Design a protein around this ligand. Structure first.
Ligand SMILES: CC(C)(C)OC(=O)N[C@H](CCN[C@@H](Cc1ccccc1)C(=O)N[C@@H](CCC(=O)O)C(=O)N[C@@H](Cc1ccccc1)C(N)=O)Cc1ccccc1
Lengths: 99, 99
């Protein structure tokens, strides 16, 4: 799909058997999702954005379905206001910017 | 131009007679540039990002050149780590997401 930017670029993602909406963020290096029930082990980690830093939990090789496109990568879980799909997962679904 | 996401989507912008690099951020509603010499009036404003909020100064109808494409719109100035070009300006240079 092509996506204009008049509205937030929100998509439907399936991660860990659950359905959620996330924002495609070309400006995020990482993918950060709000508190959720995820299976597996993890490691503590601090990450920054505008406003400061937040503590999240790192989960590697997690399966995720973004608009039907499957991908496996690191996902971070913590106190984020919105679910953010970063370039780590965006490169995997062949997502480009165009103008 | 088409832009893959393996590297940060950094572009060259000309704003206020000065040259800078900014990140094309599909996940930013607004355009936030780091402290810089801008002409005109402004209004105080708090905005949010992942780690909390930051106080910036709002400047409306500012001219900006992103990769040769001219655009006029609101730009926010404050303690941001990187210059962010938000959807307000991205819609103006006809920028889309694709996959
Ligand atoms: C997700 C991680 C991995 C933490 O990366 C980034 O945040 N990357 C930033 C891209 C921008 N991504 C979004 C992430 C986001 C979005 C929504 C909510 C929470 C987080 C953002 O900060 N967007 C801000 C950019 C500044 C701006 O637009 O004014 C935004 O759109 N904020 C809105 C929406 C908002 C409201 C309240 C709270 C938070 C956000 C606003 N109106 O202030 C760039 C960056 C890189 C490194 C260091 C600092 C900054």
């Amino acid at each position: 799909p092509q996506i204009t930017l008049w509205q937030r670029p929100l998509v439907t993602i399936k991660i860990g058997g659950q359905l959620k909406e996330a924002l495609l963020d070309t400006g995020a290096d990482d993918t950060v999702l709000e508190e959720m029930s995820l299976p597996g082990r993890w490691k503590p980690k601090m990450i920054g954005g505008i406003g400061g830093f937040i503590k999240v939990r790192q989960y590697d090789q997690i399966l995720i379905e973004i608009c039907g496109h499957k991908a496996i990568g690191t996902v971070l879980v913590g106190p984020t206001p919105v679910n953010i799909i970063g370039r780590n997962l965006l490169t995997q679904i062949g997502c480009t910017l165009n103008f």
